[PDB]
C-alpha cells in the first residue's frame, strides 16, 4: 500500500552509470563547446543508495534535471556561433544520458514489482481478502505479465488460482470475474498461438499452416504465465469449474453459439471491428484449457464439438485453422468421441469438389491431428490414409 522506496542498494551501479554519463555531458562537451567555468555545480560525488550517503546524494531526479533544465540553460548560455559548432555532440550526449536514465528507472520498476508481487503472494497465502482489493490484484497480474523468472511466475499463478477460489467461497464475484477475463485475455496474446486478425482478414482460401524481436519474448512469457494460472485453476476446481465460474464460459462460447445456422455478421470480415479478433481469442481458450479439464467436463466439450466441426467446415480461413487445432486437441484427449465425430462428419466431406473450404479444413485437421497425437494415431491411420492419398493429387496446391 505505502509508496515504495525511491532507491535500492542493488541499483547503485545504475545510478553511478547515470552519474558518469551526466558528468560526461556537463564536462567534456562544454570543454568542447567553450563554456567558462561555473557552468554548473559539480554533481554529488556519492550516489544515492550507498552506505553513508548524505541526503543530497546524486539521484535519478538530478539526472533528469541536468538533462532537461540545465541543458536548456547551458544552451542559452553558449556564445552564438559556438553553439552551432557544439550542438550535435550535445544532442548525442543528451540522448545517451536519457537512455541510461531510462535503463535505471526500468530496473527500479522491475525490483519494485517483484517485491510487491512477493508481498501480495504472502498476503493471499495467509487467507487475507481485503474489502478494497485495488493494488493486490494489480501487483499479482503484473507478475503474471512481465515476470521473466519462471519460478516466481509459477508462484504468482498459484496465487491467482487460490485467490479466485477464496473469492468464490466468499461470494463476492466482481474482481473474480474481472481477473478471469484478464487471464483469458493474456492467454491469447502470443501470435504463434492466436494470430492478429487485422493482418489475416484479407486472406481467403489459403492454408495458414504453410505461411519487434523484443516483443516476441514478452508475448510468450505472458502466455506461459496465463496458461499455468488457468491450469492450476482447473485442477483446483475439479468437476465444478463449469458451475463456479461462468465468465470463462461466455468468453469461450459466445462466438460459437453466434455464427450458428450459417449466421455471419458483415463486421466479422471487417479488419477494424474488434469482434474479428475476439472470435479467435475465444476459440484459443478451448485448446488452451481442454487437456487440463476434469473428465466431468468432457460432456461439455463433446456437446460443443458440433460447433467446432461446423467451424472447420466454415468458409472463414481462421475458423478452419482454429477448428483444426481444437479438433486435434479434442481427439487427443476426448479420444473416442472426437474421433467418432471426425470419421463420421469430417472425412466424408474431404471429397467435395465445389466446397474448397470443406477439403481445406478437413485436411488441415488431419495435419494437426497427426502432429499432436503422434504415436497415439496408430488405430486410426486406416481411416486417415485414403483421404490423404486422394488429396495428394488434388487441384489445390496447398
Amino acid at each position: 500500500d505505502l509508496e515504495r522506496p525511491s532507491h535500492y542498494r542493488d541499483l547503485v551501479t545504475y545510478v553511478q552509470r547515470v552519474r558518469s554519463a551526466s558528468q560526461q555531458l556537463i564536462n567534456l562537451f562544454r570543454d568542447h563547446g567553450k563554456v567558462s567555468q561555473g557552468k554548473l555545480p559539480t554533481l554529488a560525488v556519492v550516489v544515492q543508495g550507498e552506505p553513508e550517503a548524505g541526503p543530497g546524494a546524486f539521484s535519478i531526479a538530478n539526472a533528469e534535471k541536468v538533462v532537461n533544465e540545465d541543458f536548456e540553460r547551458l544552451k542559452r548560455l553558449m556564445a552564438p556561433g559556438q553553439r552551432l559548432i557544439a550542438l550535435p555532440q550535445l544532442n548525442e550526449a543528451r540522448e545517451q544520458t536519457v537512455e541510461v536514465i531510462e535503463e535505471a528507472k526500468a530496473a527500479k520498476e522491475a525490483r519494485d514489482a517483484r517485491i510487491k508481487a512477493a508481498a501480495a503472494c504472502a498476503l493471499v497465502a495467509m487467507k487475507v481478502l481485503p474489502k478494497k482489493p485495488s493494488p493486490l490484484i494489480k501487483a499479482i497480474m503484473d507478475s503474471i505479465k512481465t515476470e521473466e523468472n519462471q519460478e516466481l511466475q509459477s508462484r504468482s499463478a498459484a496465487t491467482i488460482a487460490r485467490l479466485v477460489q477464496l473469492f468464490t467461497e466468499s461470494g463476492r464475484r466482481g474482481p473474480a470475474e474481472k481477473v478471469v477475463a484478464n487471464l483469458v485475455k493474456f492467454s491469447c496474446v502470443e501470435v504463434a498461438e492466436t494470430p492478429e486478425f487485422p493482418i489475416h482478414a484479407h486472406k481467403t482460401n489459403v492454408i495458414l499452416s504453410m505461411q519487434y524481436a523484443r516483443e516476441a519474448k514478452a508475448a510468450r512469457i505472458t502466455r506461459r504465465g496465463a496458461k499455468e494460472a488457468l491450469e492450476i485453476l482447473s485442477k483446483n476446481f475439479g468437476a465444478e469449474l463449469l458451475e463456479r465460474v461462468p465468465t470463462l464460459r461466455t468468453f469461450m462460447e459466445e462466438p460459437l453459439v453466434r455464427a450458428f445456422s450459417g449466421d455471419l455478421p458483415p463486421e466479422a470480415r471487417d479488419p477494424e471491428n474488434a469482434f474479428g479478433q475476439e472470435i479467435v481469442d475465444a476459440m484459443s481458450v478451448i485448446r488452451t484449457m481442454t487437456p487440463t479439464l476434469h473428465p466431468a467436463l468432457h460432456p461439455f466439450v463433446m456437446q460443443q464439438v458440433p460447433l467446432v466441426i461446423k467451424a472447420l467446415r466454415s468458409d472463414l480461413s481462421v475458423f478452419r485453422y482454429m477448428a483444426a487445432k481444437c479438433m486435434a486437441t479434442i481427439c487427443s484427449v476426448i479420444t473416442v468421441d472426437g474421433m467418432t465425430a471426425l470419421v463420421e462428419k469430417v472425412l466424408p466431406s474431404i471429397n467435395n469438389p465445389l466446397d474448397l473450404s470443406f477439403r481445406q479444413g478437413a485436411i488441415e485437421v488431419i495435419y494437426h491431428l497427426i502432429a499432436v497425437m503422434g504415436d497415439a494415431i496408430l488405430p486410426y491411420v486406416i481411416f486417415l490414409i485414403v483421404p490423404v492419398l486422394g488429396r495428394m493429387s488434388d487441384s489445390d496446391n496447398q
Binding site: 552564438p80 556561433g81 559556438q82 552551432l84 559548432i85 550542438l87 550535435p88
Partner: protein, 178 residues
Amino acid sequence: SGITPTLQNIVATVNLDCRLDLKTIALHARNAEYNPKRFAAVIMRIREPKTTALIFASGKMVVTGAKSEDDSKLASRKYARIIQKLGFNAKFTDFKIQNIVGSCDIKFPIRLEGLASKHHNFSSYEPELFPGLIYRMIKPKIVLLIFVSGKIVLTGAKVREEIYQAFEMIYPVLQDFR
C-alpha cells in the same frame, strides 16, 4: 547545377524630378491611399503589371511587386504617366533596380543542423526563433534563407545573374547534407 530560380519580387526606384502635393493625388485617384500619420507616401496601385508604388512628396517613388525587369520599368513609366495626368510636371528619370528576390525548390530535405555546424562562419540558426537557416554569401552579396522542406529564397540581388550564381554556389552544399 540543375533547376533554375524563379524571381518573385523586384524593387525599383525612379525620380520624378518634381515636388508633389500628396493629398491632391489621394483625393483624385481612386487607386491611392494616404495616411500621413502612418506613412509619408501615397500608395498607388495598378493591375497590369501588378505593382505598388510608394510615391513621396520629394518626387522619389519605390515600385515593388514586379516579377521581371521589363514589367518593373513599364510599371514605373505608367505611374509617371498617372502623376502627369493629375497635373504635376513629373518626368521619368533615375531608374535603378535595387533589389531582386528569388525562390527555388530543390527536391530533397536538408539537414540544417549539420550545415550550420560546418558553415558556422557564414550562417545563423536559431530554430526557436525562426525555422529557416540564414546564410550570408560574401562574393555575390546574396543572403539565402534555407528551409528543411528543400526550399531556398535568395534576396539582396541587383541582377538576375547574382541569384543564379548564388544558387550555383550553394547547391553543392545542400547536396552534401541530404
